[PDB]
Amino acid sequence: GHMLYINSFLDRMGEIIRGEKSVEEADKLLDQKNIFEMFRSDCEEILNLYKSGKAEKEEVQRNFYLLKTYVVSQLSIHFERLKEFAESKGEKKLDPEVINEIALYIDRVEKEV
Amino acid sequence: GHMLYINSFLDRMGEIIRGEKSVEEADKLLDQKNIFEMFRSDCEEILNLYKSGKAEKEEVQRNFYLLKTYVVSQLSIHFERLKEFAESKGFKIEKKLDPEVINEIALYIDRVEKEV
Secondary structure (H helix, E strand, C coil): CCCECCCHHHHHHHHHHCCCCCHHHHHHHCCHHHHHHHHHHHHHHHHHHHHCCCCCHHHHHHHHHHHHHHHHHCHHHHHHHHHHHHHCCCCCCCCHHHHHHHHHHHHHHHHCC | CCCECCCHHHHHHHHHHHCCCCHHHHHHHCCHHHHHHHHHHHHHHHHHHHHCCCCCHHHHHHHHHHHHHHHHHCHHHHHHHHHHHHHHCCCCCCCCCCHHHHHHHHHHHHHHHCCC
């Protein structure tokens, strides 16, 4: 697989950084509970694509591999970047242990595939 | 939204790391000339999804944003990752990636991003 990559957190960060959406939005985004939920929804959406045959299994597997690798390798850095982007214009953080839980959840959901 | 994200370098790297492809393949992947041509071919595939109506302009705009930001901010890291991976595994690579080449790939994407 080679095309499919849902990631709501990443796209929403990009909207704010490109100045397409208000920096005020960083506040709900930088909330670890909402972040955990965003990824859950991503997982549910990707899985629904597989279940309905709309995306082939290999594209959904690629998306899960990318999503897990994003959470493990980039999410902590991105959160801090966006936290710093926001503050440098006028709070909370993301516990490494929540990041693990997101990775765990993606591992779980995927087993279905 | 958005679902589309073509990136051939990222996927091939991931395939070598996962063991789906031989480590023998890292050497070809990490030739900076092949790297530049790979991103050029990706832009063209992406442009053709738009031009064949398989992806809307905002999907391909998302792909080019991620691809441009991948090149400027992740491509050197993944290059080094893969070297470090091929070395441990016993196939040390004697290739490097010019900062200037990174710049020219980003700039090239920046170029085709300006559309159709």
